[PDB]
RNA sequence: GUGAAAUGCGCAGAUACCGGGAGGAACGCCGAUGGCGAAGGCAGCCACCUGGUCCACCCGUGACGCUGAGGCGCGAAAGCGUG
RNA sequence: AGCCUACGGGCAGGCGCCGAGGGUAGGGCCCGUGACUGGGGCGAAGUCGUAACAAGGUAGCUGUACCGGAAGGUGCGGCUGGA
RNA sequence: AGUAAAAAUGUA
RNA sequence: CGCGGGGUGGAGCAGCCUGGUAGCUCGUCGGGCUCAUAACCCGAAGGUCGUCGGUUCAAAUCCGGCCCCCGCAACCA
RNA sequence: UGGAGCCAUGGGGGAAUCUGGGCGGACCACCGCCUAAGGCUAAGUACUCCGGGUGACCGAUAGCGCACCAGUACCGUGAGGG
RNA sequence: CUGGCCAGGGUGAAGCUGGGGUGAGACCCAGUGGAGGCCCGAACCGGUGGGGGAUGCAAACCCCUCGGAUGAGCUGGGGCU
RNA sequence: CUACGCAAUGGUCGUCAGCGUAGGGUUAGGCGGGACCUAAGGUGAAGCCGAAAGGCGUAGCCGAAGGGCAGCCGGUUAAUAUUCCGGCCCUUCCCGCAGGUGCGAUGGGGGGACGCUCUAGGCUAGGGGGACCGGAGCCAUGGACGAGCCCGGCCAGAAGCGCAGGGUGGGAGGUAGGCAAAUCCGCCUCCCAACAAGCUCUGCGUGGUGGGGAAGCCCGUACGGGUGACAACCCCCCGAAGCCAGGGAGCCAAGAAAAGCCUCUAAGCACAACCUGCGGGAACCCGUACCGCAAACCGACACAGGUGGGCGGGUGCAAGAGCACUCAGGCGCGCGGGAGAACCCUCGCCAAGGAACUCUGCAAGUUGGCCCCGUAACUUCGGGAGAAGGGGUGCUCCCUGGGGUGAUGAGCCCCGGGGAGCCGCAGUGAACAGGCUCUGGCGACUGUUUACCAAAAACACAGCUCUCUGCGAACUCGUAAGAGGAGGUAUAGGGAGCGACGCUUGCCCGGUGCCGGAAGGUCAAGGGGAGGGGUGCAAGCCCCGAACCGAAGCCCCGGUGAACGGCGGCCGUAACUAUAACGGUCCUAAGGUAGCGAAAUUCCUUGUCGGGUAAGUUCCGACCUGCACGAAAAGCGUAACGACCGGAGCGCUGUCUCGGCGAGGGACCCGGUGAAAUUGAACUGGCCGUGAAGAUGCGGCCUACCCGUGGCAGGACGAAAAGACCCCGUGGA
RNA sequence: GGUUUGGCACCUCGAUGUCGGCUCGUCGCAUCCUGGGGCUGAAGAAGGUCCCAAGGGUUGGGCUGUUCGCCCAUUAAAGCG
């Protein structure tokens, strides 16, 4: 719903926070699955490779199940839904009957108690994972594999989701969150429903910290630096680029396409 | 004001230590260079 | 395409025809000097939820009525905010 | 610390409350005035078009929105006070 | 098979 | 003032480079249409090519001299 | 880059066993040299930490940085300077 | 990566609770509550204006003054470029 | 630490010392490290990569103020002590005995285990009183033999007890999971039990008992020793930020790991073995002096600087780690002694005036705490607010209301309320302790920055838009392997500009960029070889070489502005004049819209009017002929915020008219110690003149006894720095 | 004449600090006052103009960094170098 605050301090007049109603009945992670020290650090061996990262609240990684074919036919009651500092989404802790339990990117609609499962069979209803092919051409689904037995990799950000457009061979056509039309395999699992917490896109950070709390350092504009730093740099008295919108490395940043030309992944796309 | 030198034994040994000098070929040369020269301490003395 | 034209579209294969798919909006005939609602206004079909309205029986209450400054709700279209 | 006494006491006198009024500060209501600017009223002489009244030569009018030297044009819906 | 082009302005 | 662009019928532009030919639009004058005036139609007239000199057989045209119009520039102290 | 062979080889193609195969400065024909795609081999040659011998070499601001308890004192985080 | 520190005041958000309100509401009052790159101001961090200092106490200092002071805060130790 | 010492070191002195010579001095199963654990990271079997050198890298290994682990109170030394000693209390290993039990991991599970802010109830630390307890003593100087003054009224302590809390359901079935191997976890099912109890675990109180135990007086160099009493060792009150601790509540940014430690079982092995007792043995290595906000550390120095954690008492002030004084404890800053100049520094006051000072109220003053009334425009309804502007404030006595502790009564604390009355110039009587308001500009705001001349209108910022990226993502680093991105997946990640919020953001794809275009044009290697050449008697062996087929790119076609960017000229025309709504014409890709406008932009320029002043190149309001605004290098606004830059008032002032006096530190004199830049040599005057054009040094003339000391700053083209400007160099970056 | 703007480039680039103000002055006379004086289109008062003459005087504010100006209120005058 997004909570709002009276303006009793600027930087909090617009600030808004997500309505943590859904999570409820569990805030402290599952000391069993999750208990994974997440490694923080904004670069590789030595040098920083992604500018402006670092700082920002401590964080424990909740290990989740991105491939459901593990326990086919084995059902599981959705025990709870919790907060996961590692994604836009929320996650549902579910207890499989095997006794074993794991985490799943909590879809919009999921209710605690509501039992669910995955398999070729499985009732076509939110929370159940089935090979794309065994799914009603139309129904919306999220957490989609891209290649059989390779794990879920599509539509996992709060409220994202893909829709089945149709079939064609061993493949099925998906309209991905971005809007591109791709031909995913049939054997590619995918759990029915949309990602949920769709309210996410609506939070207003508010201050400059908060942006810090999320580990995102300040971003200094090219034209502010000098010739040596960025190409937009230099210029006595603020100026305007000098043509034509480029990045610190040299490439243009307005328009110029990037994806590998002759990539074999093409010819499976159309948008 | 705080000056450039802020003594710290662990640091000193770990940085210019005999062991350290031996790991890198560049360091090995330093050692060689010194011995060749006739220094009394190949490495910074520090107990 | 018009009064006639021109812009524009098409020999990179348009217009015209057939097959396939996507998507959005609107619901032809029925349809009317018709119906419903307090007003604005309401049209494919199905279901669920629901308001008002009319007829017959004279069964019940027993003047419990009418209007209504203010208040309150509704209120075409265009317009504004967020997605 | 005086003055009369009939020594209880009264008087003068001193202190304080309130207090006209003066002073400081901050407000409220009304009036005059002000470089410049916004429309409005009437104009016996000007400039530009011609919007509306006869399909007024694109029915008109209208709430709204946008745009235009101006009247006004066009969009969405509405009215007949048009056919 | 009768919806259908343009053509302003002017009183001594 | 220093490099550079320009003055051609009444207005606004060609023509100059590739010297011997002054073109275009509006306006002005004559006649129509109209009751009338615009518009519309038909027909005409109108230019020292800034100025003084030079080259040449001939100069708006090419060469220097001034007259003005417009545009850059006039920086380090 | 030249008329550019010879010797080596990253890439592609890809033989022959003496009627075999390379070379003699493109390339041909002559004439002639030599036997690739396995390996080894003293001596004559280089240098001077070390020992000795000399010197129209220095003689303590010279001569090695050091004639002396010097790569020390001292300086530098350090390499290093000295 | 792991530890530590932030005197004492001030203001008084959302929530709760109770009353009012309506058909149910929105909402409105109190009391509670203790939010915030909130306020004042030490430590701690900083370095605004002025003066002094200028072979200095000091190769950046001293005094007065001033800014932040629960945060994008300050800080020790162990690390990496 | 001690004994001898004083050359040098010490800014003087020096018998002293951190100095010289010598001798001592550092004692641990429990404190801290290691024979424990893991973090970032390092290393690194395997494995990948790399011209060599090397670079990655799973497990493992290293890596600690983090986790884990058993010592408290006293006493002694010249110098060490949780280390030696005394009392009290623990910990492991090993062997033995006894009694228990399926014992047993490098494996399984649990646990260890975690944020921020706010917090409850108890405790202790610490502190304050006491008429009570113990104790030498003391009546001074006018008064007091006094409930007088003065000093001390604690520490540790096993079991056992009490008091606070912390943890925790007990059963019995199944069981497809915990890379099943489990009686353990985990899941389903159901007799039971409960906002518990029971069982455990800390803290605190108590505890056999063991220590400690002043003031003053006597000895006394030193340091300390009897004294001291058989000392007392009790009662209330205040009370943590610490403990009980893994307590509670709220919140979003969602808060290490591993071992120890429980338990489950596998091999194994049960004459094992582990478990609880109880005896007796065993228990290593390293550190321990001393300095430690500093004279012992970093700053060449005994340097006014820098340096992390804990304790840090009392009274008063609303609070407090603030301010004043002061305990304990530590110091008086390792040159002194006199003077009583100018001048400098720091500091106090000042007649009348009160910003006239000046670039500028720069500096300084004013104001200041708290309680109480009382407060404007504007506003995003939070704020503006401490707006402003006022009143109160000490002490005395009387009356009176709550709360905490008790016990509902009492003292003891904690907040109040109303009366009278007292003295000063003055009551936050000293110290800490805002001056205010009006109006502009820029930026929204807290924040960041040029360590050492710039703190800002600059960067950042939430937020807006464009663009890329479908995941072995784009992108970044790397030769690569690999890594970041991300153990993320378009509500996400990269790049770019703008920069809260409000109203908005026009027109121009000609040129440039990017995006789309299976056509054409052009296009390399290569394919193809018409045709030609060199040689051979030749078969041949060699060379060139036209057609034509041949990518990307460019061309061409089209799109695109919150992509780079651009967004006109000349004439004419309306009742006086003006001006031009209107028109003509040339050019363009299209000719700048709204809104602003002598502005952080306006040259002319102090434009022209208004306002404000006695007077206003600034400031504010207007007008627009805008040299040279203008919409995301955003346009115009905006409450709040600002050590930002401007203009005004009020307040108050030594800024000033205009200076005066006073204080302290220097300066000055004496004793001690004793530098520096600079320096061709000097026996170094003025004026006119001359000279390389500004002379103590030449000419003429003038003046002038030799030498100092305190002062001033005109000259010695005074010092300093082989001029940053300028030019030159076929100089550099 | 040597106070402006310049011209030339002679000393100085192993450095001659380069506007304005303040403090402190000092000199020139081509005199702004004040003292003498000649003409006058000098009635008087007041001026104009030239001559002699620096001895001493030559104000305080607004604006601007300003010099300079302009302005306010004065003055015997508000001199120039
Ligand atoms: Mg690494
Ligand atoms: Mg930025
Ligand atoms: Mg810059
Ligand atoms: Mg760089
Ligand atoms: Mg560029
Ligand atoms: Mg560049
Ligand atoms: Mg500029
Ligand atoms: Mg640039
Ligand atoms: Mg140093
Ligand atoms: Mg260390
Ligand atoms: Mg040796
Ligand atoms: Mg076809
Ligand atoms: Mg019905
Ligand atoms: Mg009845
Ligand atoms: Mg609508
Ligand atoms: Mg709009
Ligand atoms: Mg809308
Ligand atoms: Mg929309
Ligand atoms: Mg009164
Ligand atoms: Mg008025
Ligand atoms: Mg009017
Ligand atoms: Mg007229
Ligand atoms: Mg009309
Ligand atoms: Mg009409
Ligand atoms: Mg309309
Ligand atoms: Mg239109
Ligand atoms: Mg209509
Ligand atoms: Mg007319
Ligand atoms: Mg008429
Ligand atoms: Mg002409
Ligand atoms: Mg005519
Ligand atoms: Mg006509
Ligand atoms: Mg230049
Ligand atoms: Mg080869
Ligand atoms: Mg080959
Ligand atoms: Mg053979
Ligand atoms: Mg060969
Ligand atoms: Mg050959
Ligand atoms: Mg040969
Ligand atoms: Mg040959
Ligand atoms: Mg040969
Ligand atoms: Mg051989
Ligand atoms: Mg061989
Ligand atoms: Mg050999
Ligand atoms: Mg030899
Ligand atoms: Mg020598
Ligand atoms: Mg000698
Ligand atoms: Mg030698
Ligand atoms: Mg030597
Ligand atoms: Mg050193
Ligand atoms: Mg050293
Ligand atoms: Mg409340
Ligand atoms: Mg704050
Ligand atoms: Mg503060
Ligand atoms: Mg303050
Ligand atoms: Mg502290
Ligand atoms: Mg800083
Ligand atoms: Mg400081
Ligand atoms: Mg300062
Ligand atoms: Mg500064
Ligand atoms: Mg200073
Ligand atoms: Mg100074
Ligand atoms: Mg402060
Ligand atoms: Mg740190
Ligand atoms: Mg370190
Ligand atoms: Mg002695
Ligand atoms: Mg001495
Ligand atoms: Mg000694
Ligand atoms: Mg270890
Ligand atoms: Mg380990
Ligand atoms: Mg590790
Ligand atoms: Mg390695
Ligand atoms: Mg440790
Ligand atoms: Mg520890
Ligand atoms: Mg000691
Ligand atoms: Mg002991
Ligand atoms: Mg067992
Ligand atoms: Mg675990
Ligand atoms: Mg006591
Ligand atoms: Mg007496
Ligand atoms: Mg006790
Ligand atoms: Mg507490
Ligand atoms: Mg381990
Ligand atoms: Mg051992
Ligand atoms: Mg010690
Ligand atoms: Mg200090
Ligand atoms: Mg400390
Ligand atoms: Mg000293
Ligand atoms: Mg010091
Ligand atoms: Mg510091
Ligand atoms: Mg400190
Ligand atoms: Mg106190
Ligand atoms: Mg106080
Ligand atoms: Mg203090
Ligand atoms: Mg003392
Ligand atoms: Mg005074
Ligand atoms: Mg006075
Ligand atoms: Mg005054
Ligand atoms: Mg002034
Ligand atoms: Mg002045
Ligand atoms: Mg000041
Ligand atoms: Mg304010
Ligand atoms: Mg204000
Ligand atoms: Mg008193
Ligand atoms: Mg108590
Ligand atoms: Mg105070
Ligand atoms: Mg204050
Ligand atoms: Mg303005
Ligand atoms: Mg301004
Ligand atoms: Mg700012
Ligand atoms: Mg700086
Ligand atoms: Mg600042
Ligand atoms: Mg915005
Ligand atoms: Mg490569
Ligand atoms: Mg990852
Ligand atoms: Mg981004
Ligand atoms: Mg993005
Ligand atoms: Mg900007
Ligand atoms: Mg336009
Ligand atoms: Mg364009
Ligand atoms: Mg284009
Ligand atoms: Mg185009
Ligand atoms: Mg293209
Ligand atoms: Mg070819
Ligand atoms: Mg041939
Ligand atoms: Mg091509
Ligand atoms: Mg005319
Ligand atoms: Mg006229
Ligand atoms: Mg413009
Ligand atoms: Mg405009
Ligand atoms: Mg002005
Ligand atoms: Mg401008
Ligand atoms: Mg101007
Ligand atoms: Mg100007
Ligand atoms: Mg005025
Ligand atoms: Mg003023
Ligand atoms: Mg004015
Ligand atoms: Mg002023
Ligand atoms: Mg203005
Ligand atoms: Mg601009
Ligand atoms: Mg735009
Ligand atoms: Mg722009
Ligand atoms: Mg802006
Ligand atoms: Mg503005
Ligand atoms: Mg500020
Ligand atoms: Mg700030
Ligand atoms: Mg201001
Ligand atoms: Mg004195
Ligand atoms: Mg002396
Ligand atoms: Mg001379
Ligand atoms: Mg001589
Ligand atoms: Mg002379
Ligand atoms: Mg002297
Ligand atoms: Mg002096
Ligand atoms: Mg001088
Ligand atoms: Mg000099
Ligand atoms: Mg030079
Ligand atoms: Mg420089
Ligand atoms: Mg001169
Ligand atoms: Mg001159
Ligand atoms: Mg010269
Ligand atoms: Mg010459
Ligand atoms: Mg020079
Ligand atoms: Mg010199
Ligand atoms: Mg003078
Ligand atoms: Mg004279
Ligand atoms: Mg007279």
Author numbering:
A (entry chain AD): 2 to 272
B (entry chain A7): 1 to 47
Paper lines:
After the controlled degradation of RelB by Lon protease, RelE is able to bind the ribosome and specifically cleave messenger RNA (mRNA) in the A site (Christensen and Gerdes, 2003; Christensen et al., 2001; Galvani et al., 2001; Li et al., 2009; Pedersen et al., 2003). E. coli RelE is an 11.2 kDa protein consisting of a compact, four-stranded antiparallel β sheet flanked by three α helices.
Under these conditions, RelEwt cleaves the unmodified mRNA inside the ribosome, and complexes representing the uncleaved (2′-O-methyl mRNA + RelER45A/R81A) and cleaved (unmodified mRNA + RelEwt) states were subsequently crystallized in space group P212121 with two ribosomes per asymmetric unit (Selmer et al., 2006). In the structure determined using RelEwt and unmodified mRNA, cleavage has occurred prior to crystallization, and there is weak but consistent density for just positions 1 and 2 of the A site codon, thus representing a postcleavage state. In the postcleavage structure, A20 maintains the stacking interaction with Y87 but has moved slightly back toward the normal mRNA path. RelE occupies the A site in near identical conformations in both the pre- and postcleavage structures and blocks access of translation factors and tRNA to the ribosome. In both the pre- and postcleavage structures, we observe similar, tight interactions between RelE and 16S rRNA, while contacts to the 50S subunit and ribosomal proteins are almost absent.
